[PDB]
RNA sequence: AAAAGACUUCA
RNA sequence: UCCGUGAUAGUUUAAUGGUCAGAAUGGGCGCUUGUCGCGUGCCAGAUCGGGGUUCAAUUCCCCGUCGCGGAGCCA
RNA sequence: UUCAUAGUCAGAGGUGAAAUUCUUGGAUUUAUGAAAGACGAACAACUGCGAAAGCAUUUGCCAAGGAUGUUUUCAUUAAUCAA
RNA sequence: AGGAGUCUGACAUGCGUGCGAGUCGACGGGUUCUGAAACCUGGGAUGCGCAAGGAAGCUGACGAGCGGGAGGCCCUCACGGGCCGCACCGCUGGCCGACCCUGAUCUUCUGUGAAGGGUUCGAGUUGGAGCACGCCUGUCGGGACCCGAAAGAUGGUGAACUAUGCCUGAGCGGGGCGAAGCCAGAGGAAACUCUGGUGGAGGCUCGAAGCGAUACUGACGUGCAAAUCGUUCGUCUGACUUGGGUAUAGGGGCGAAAGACUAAUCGAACCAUCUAGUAGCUGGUUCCCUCCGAAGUUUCCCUCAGGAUAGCUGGAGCCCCGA
RNA sequence: GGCGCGGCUGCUUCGGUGAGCCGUGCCAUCGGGUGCUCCAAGUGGGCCAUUUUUGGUAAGCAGAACUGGCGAUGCG
RNA sequence: GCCGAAGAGGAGAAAGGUUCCAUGUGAACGGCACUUGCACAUGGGUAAGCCGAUCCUAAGGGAAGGGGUAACCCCGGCGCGAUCACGCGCAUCCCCGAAAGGGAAUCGGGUUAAGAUUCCCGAGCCGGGUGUGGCGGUUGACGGCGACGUGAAGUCCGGAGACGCCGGCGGGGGCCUCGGGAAGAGUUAUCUUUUCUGCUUAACGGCCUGCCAACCCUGGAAACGGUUCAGCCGGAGGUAGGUCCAGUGGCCGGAAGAGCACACGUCGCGCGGUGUCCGGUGCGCCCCCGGCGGCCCAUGAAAAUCCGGAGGACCGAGUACCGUCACGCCCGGUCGUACUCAUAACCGCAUCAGGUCUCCAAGGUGAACAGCCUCUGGCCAAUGGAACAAUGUAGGCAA
RNA sequence: AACAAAGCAUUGCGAUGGUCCUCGCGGAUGCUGACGCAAUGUGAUUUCUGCCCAGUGCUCUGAAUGUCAAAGUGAAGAAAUUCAACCAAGCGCGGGUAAACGGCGGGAGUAACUAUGACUCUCUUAAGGUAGCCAAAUGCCUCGUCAUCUAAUUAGUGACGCGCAUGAAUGAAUUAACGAGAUUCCCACUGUCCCUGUCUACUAUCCAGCGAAACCACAGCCAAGGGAACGGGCUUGGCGGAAUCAGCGGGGAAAGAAGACCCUGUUGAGCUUGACUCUAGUCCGACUUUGUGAAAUGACUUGAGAGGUGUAGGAUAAGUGGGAGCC
RNA sequence: CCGGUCUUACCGGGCCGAUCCGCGGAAGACAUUGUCAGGUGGGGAGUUUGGCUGGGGCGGCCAAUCUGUUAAAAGAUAACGCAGGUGUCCUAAGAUGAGCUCAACGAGAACAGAAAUCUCGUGUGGAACAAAAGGGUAAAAGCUCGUUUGAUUCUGAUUUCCAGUACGAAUACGAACCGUGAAAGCGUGGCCUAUCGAUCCUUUAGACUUCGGAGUUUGAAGCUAGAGGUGUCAGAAAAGUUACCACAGGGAUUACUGGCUUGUGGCAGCCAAGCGUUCAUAGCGACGUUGCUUUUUGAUCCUUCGAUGUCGGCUCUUCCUAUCAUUGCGAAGCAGAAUUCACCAAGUGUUGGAUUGUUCACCCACCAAUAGGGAACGUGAGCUGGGUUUAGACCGUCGUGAGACAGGUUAGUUUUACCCUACUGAUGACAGUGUCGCGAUAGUAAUUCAACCUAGUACGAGAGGAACCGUUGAUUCACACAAUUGGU
């Protein structure tokens, strides 16, 4: 049989983890006391910040308003466009402008959105990473529904009540570039959760995977594995669809 | 609104 | 050199229960067409070499020539 | 087109002819409703405008340019031009 | 000097001794010496026997010689035969259950049971037995004559070595080359261009501290050293080097993945235990003498480096033909 | 071993025969090289020579047969 | 003669664990001698308010439900006022975790065989904790256009500490250096003299000509002006100029006719001299420090502590209220400190050519490497003797 | 030359993510969000990356038909035991899918000089090797053949060439920079060489002192022969004055290691897989947790009705007691 | 609004002052656990993975069974010994009785050749009997015809199995029961010589037995007998790799050195077809045949596996002769003359380079010629370390894969202080002394070339082109010295 399979090693361990002391702060979205047409939630950017542990930026807001409990606070997520000095407002009435976050039912269709509730002060969820941006298709008034489209295509049918940002999400193209150094590339598998640099299955001798072996490198049974495998064996190909590079489409998904 | 291709050189 | 794996018409290549052998292409003959070709009807194998068993062997054994794959450590 | 809902049967799609495809797990075709994306039919004409490329939903905003008419200014100031 | 047939059980025996169709004694009490033990005794325990068969019902006799050949007698005695007579072996056949067949008398619910035969198996006579301990010898066993491997398993102890991570510090002489783009000078309508020039980017170059470890296939090779020395060679602002504090622990970890690395131990750490593993294999197994004196063949066998069963041997008893 | 007497029996015609059995009498060049029982051993891998072989060019080959020796046998 | 970033200088971390100092020995050690020693024996030495521990918090060791797991084992009111005694307010807890992250305060001279920034002598300061008076002030401060300089419960907001890499200007430091040239030392087969040491003093109470950066100060009013090493800056008002703030291990000057020797000259004391010398060069951007530009698919710790903004209920009469000066005092209650730190004190079985961390990158010529040096300083490794063949190992040169 | 790498592709993932550790809590995912995370293939640039879905893998839809477990459910039935009906995922039935595993052959005849073959055939098993490269770090034959270079070159380089057995992300070709990587050539130079010398140093040697191990059944001459066929010693021959110093290591099958090779042993161990058997994990159906009901559509009591398909018989003799009369 | 107070006042407490009333979301009889069922399931774990055998593989059956030969044996008898069969096929391809007798050849029949068919004659085992071999048999055991069922049940003495060991098989009976047949008899499977499967379980057969108060149904348990898998045939449920390896052993067994052999290899003799114009023997020489060597290869398995260090090379000593050169020779198809073949002969020589790890061999210029063969393929307590031959890696080929190849490639370690012995070299007693000597005996030193004299002679048509001494010098080796030249 053989020794572990790195696969395994996800598992835990100090070796698998992120920084997660590292990271900079929880970002959740300020669930609103009540009303918001302008300022139970005002808030002015003061600063942007990198965020390490997504590599994008937040955005310091100061936001200030009282009760007790009256909660308040801190670095939410940017958008494109979000600068100091500039106002943000969290609700309801909130105006519909590019920074400012609100439930889906007040949002107008066809206003790409960032930081989409699955579930109602969840805070948000989807539309997060650098760039990218839901979009809200569907809603009508609608009681029941709002149809969300996600940067994968994907029609999302999520709660009116959950609520988003209005824009993209900043750090857009950040993917375009290539890294150019290996050195570029080990700094910022550091800061994230990952085992880096990553040998070749079919680099290694046979205990350590079931690609390795052989004289000449190759995998000696065919790489796409089974849904029903189990971790060790599930390696290469799990389950796939369709191979190389032709004739699909993107996902194309049913409601 | 058309199934269907060729066809040696110099005179 | 050892263990595995085949061969059937000019060529590529199906097939059986022991009594029965095919296809496609290529080719041989007509018709298309002014003439070739595209197309259209017609035709034609000692099942590798070899011996044995049987009522009857293309089919069941054994050998061999060739073409294949797969092994051949610790020097 | 997709989604949902209504109803419903043996086709549909497509062409030269067909097949791929789609198809009983109820399609397609049919009605209404939603969201998204694209484009502006009808209008759009031997037609108008920008220096040219080009530019066509109506509608609102900033701001340009060519007509004219004035006889105001420079009173012939100007023209074309490789780099 | 130490260093190998031990210990006792079972099952089978040899040799011996007491009673002998039963024998056989714990445990208690009774009692001395002695922690002992002994003796009397109830007599546990109910073996092996005393007769057997078989799934189970349930059933269940002992008479005979024949031959060889022990020995007595009769005789008659130089010889000698006749008879019985039993050892013991060979040979014969009936019986008692089981199987199968015929079954009387008859009882008359029901079936028992004379006579007789076949058949194999076991049993019974002339082939009538044991028990008990001791002392032997074997077999199997328990570590099983003794030593001798790699192992597998459980639970602990190791990241002071080393791998990777994290935290937080520290280190990199000096020199070379010259990316961003802007000045002047200069051109063009613009676009932007030419030449001088500045500034300095870099898993950049030559190289110090520091890291690494290519070559002599040198020196050493019971060393300075359980991987060292000299000289050579590579890197040296980076995916770098490194101090400390520190994660991740055994088919698990860690690996830029070599089966590399986890305290001199790694294709599965170390410790202790299971454990006196287990070895058809190698080695060894310690006093004298006598009588006889090998096999290296045959069938079976996951069988051919062994078992098994005869074959080859030898002892111990019993008896009196054979080329 | 052979004979006679007497009983019983068999297989194969209500048919012919011996054989078997029992009972009873009669008459007849070697020389212990040897039987039976219990329990135990190494084995349960050989060799060679001679003779006869079969394979193999052969072999200090391989593999049998028949025997004597070595193994386990001194001494000359 | 050798050692030179330490093939052998100084200070230390870990580790050792008394190895240190002294005296006395010499059986064993030291791979040999030994009078010696890091061998043996006996005595002796380490002294902290101001060094460090200590307090904080960082990967994490986690204490704390519930629950798997028998189980081992593993994941995830308190506080404060308040004096008369009593009531009021809130959110994520509490310890360990760096003797090299962060941090309240000390130097100079002297002295011991052995300690020493540790005791002393002089001087200073801190922290923590009760009294005192000078007065600076009083319906909670004047001055300076301004900037800015010279009370107090309930209650919110917060810096410093506190932070990456590259390049790299500026201040100035101790250096290195030169000369005027003291004071005093070398030395001349044969001189000019030069050459050499040497001229040295705190921490810090007080003064500063106080750089850069910010001055959206004021004031001025540039459409081309100012200005850098470079980028730049400006009419959301440039350059002048009237102002500010504002560093330092940094100028001054005091601490300080406090101070031990440096050297010579002296029995001892003393006395003189040096310590109250002058001036400057060399991007040595070195270590400390303040700025700038550039850079990252990569963003560079936290808390203790120090410390103030507010925004204020209450309280301000010959009564009564605070806060730097000064000052007076007490406390200062814990542990550690020796020595080695390595070709002999660590790890490696050894007095092992191995391994093992920080600072001293400013010692002189030459910065191409390497060498040589010197007032630091340190050393001649536990074997010698006499020859010198071949063989061998290091190694030069060969027509 | 191995690994990494930046760059290039497939695939899984809609969040309580899929995936890893874990009985579990929970954690790691991720205090992230498809421009993200895992799982894998290949490996800068540059030009490119052909054909095959038959087998294997995997995946898709399956409201319908042959196979497809258990339970509940029906039949015989005292049980139970035998049988049925229902049927998931899974075989079947069908498709997609090679930058998935991988594959890319076979033999023929033929031109108006011969030569050669543009031209006609199919089969295994899906296809039948395109661009390239090619005497290859892949070529057996083998030092292939030609050329360069050298005197002379199994080397090296260039060209050819049915390639024993090249070939496209099992990546093909190509290629600047880089390199303690592999091979080759030239100049410079030289003691590597002709071919050895002298010289230094420390050893050596000798002296004083200190003072070891390995190893040791064995006395220890040569040439022959013999012998278990590789004798220091038997046998015959031949030689030898001992002892001691220094050396060259010929021999003692010299010491040093119970051969790593190889064979066996009903030995071990790591690894593999479509041997065997199992065991986690995943998918899927059922049972508890568990409470409701629309009806559509299955079923049971009573009660009141339409009627009851064996030969002949108008039609109603399905089959039982009753049975001479009920209004 | 109330209370307290000093009611031109001050304090406390309650209510109202943007509300009455009555943790959030999602989702819900699912899901998630708990449990069970089917499917996938080297992710993990435990395991196995057939002998023989001229080494194990790899091919093969010679792990069961028959035979002619082997086989010397009455019986028993080996080899991967020769030769070849059986693992089926048969209710007629059995049984019996009556009745017939061949295969085949000649002769005869228009057509028919394959021509049967039909006839006659001769016809002894050559035919016929399913099937190997072999042996057997002529009113049959073979043929023909009818009938029949005994290929029935149960039992077995005994032989084979095997000298005593099982299943199997045979060779007979008896008991029961039939047939045919005239019957006597024959008939206990196949002409004969004999043609296969335990053990649990299951299956059924027959009858009977049995399962713990009585009583009754259901099944179970069982005796005796037959059929269902074991061809690893006297009976396992069952694949590989390891070059990462490990262990116990074996020279019981390989590679490997040695030894035996000597087919192979090398060399020779004999004979002499034949060719060389003619001429066997100047030379060349087949077929055939006998040998010698031990230095290639093969064979064997004696020696070592508690260890024999590998190839190639280098250097260093020694040898053989089957002689390449040199000396002396003989013949010639030897006019000179280069030569060609061969005799005696081992003294001395036998080289330097290019490719390749190479040995070998190819090539180049040399040379007088650049011989071959042994000494453990002489030579690792000398060296070297390129190949071979560990662990890393690539390519090709094969394999599902681990991984493999007498397929290629890059990288990849060389221990020891000499006790004995051997020799080189130095010491060194006894004896009446030192020195000078003798010389038994022991080691070997000179080899070869070029050129000149002879001679442009001999010999020769010519072309070309010799000898002996006499002279000079140099290659190679040895000893030695150092004036010179050269090094230091």
Redesign the pocket.
């Known amino acids: 049989?053989?020794?572990?399979?790195?696969?395994?090693?996800?598992?835990?361990?100090?070796?698998?983890?992120?920084?997660?002391?590292?990271?900079?702060?929880?970002?959740?979205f300020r669930s609103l006391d009540f009303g918001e047409r302008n300022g139970y939630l005002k808030g002015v950017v003061t600063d942007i910040?990198?965020?390490?542990?997504?590599?994008?930026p937040l955005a310091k807001v100061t936001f200030r308003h009282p009760f007790?409990?009256?909660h308040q606070k801190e670095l939410f997520?940017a958008a494109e466009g979000m600068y100091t000095g500039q106002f943000v407002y969290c609700g309801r009435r909130a105006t519909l402008s590019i920074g400012n976050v609100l439930p889906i039912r007040s949002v107008?269709?066809?206003?790409?959105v960032?930081n989409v509730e699955?579930?109602?002060?969840?805070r948000g969820?989807?539309?997060?990473?650098?760039?990218?941006?839901?979009?809200?298709?569907?809603?009508?008034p609608?009681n029941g529904t709002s149809?969300i489209?996600?940067?994968?295509?994907?029609?999302?049918?999520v709660?009116s009540?959950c609520r988003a940002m209005i824009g993209?999400?900043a750090?857009?193209?950040?993917?375009?570039?290539?890294?150019?150094?290996?050195?570029?590339?080990?700094?910022?598998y550091?800061?994230?959760?990952?085992?880096?640099?990553?040998?070749?299955?079919?680099?290694?001798?046979?205990?350590?995977?079931?690609?390795?072996?052989?004289?000449?490198?190759?995998?000696?049974?065919?790489?796409?594995?089974?849904?029903?495998?189990?971790?060790?064996?599930?390696?290469?190909?799990?389950?796939?669809?369709?191979?190389?590079?032709?004739?699909?489409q993107a996902?194309?998904?049913?409601?």
């Open positions: 049989m053989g020794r572990v399979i790195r696969a395994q090693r996800k598992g835990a361990g100090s070796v698998f983890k992120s920084h997660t002391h590292h990271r900079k702060g929880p970002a959740r910040i990198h965020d390490p542990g997504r590599g994008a007790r409990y009256k997520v107008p269709e066809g206003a790409v960032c699955h579930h109602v002060g969840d969820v989807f539309a997060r990473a650098s760039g990218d941006y839901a979009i809200v298709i569907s809603h009508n609608d149809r489209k996600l940067p994968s295509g994907a029609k999302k049918i709660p009540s993209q999400v750090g857009g193209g950040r993917t375009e570039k290539p890294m150019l150094k290996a050195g570029n590339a080990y700094h910022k550091r800061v994230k959760r990952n085992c880096w640099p990553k040998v070749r299955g079919v680099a290694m001798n046979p205990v350590e995977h079931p690609h390795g072996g052989g004289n000449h490198q190759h995998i000696g049974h065919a790489s796409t594995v089974r849904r029903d495998a189990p971790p060790g064996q599930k390696v290469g190909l799990i389950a796939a669809r369709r191979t190389g590079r032709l004739r699909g996902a194309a998904t049913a409601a």
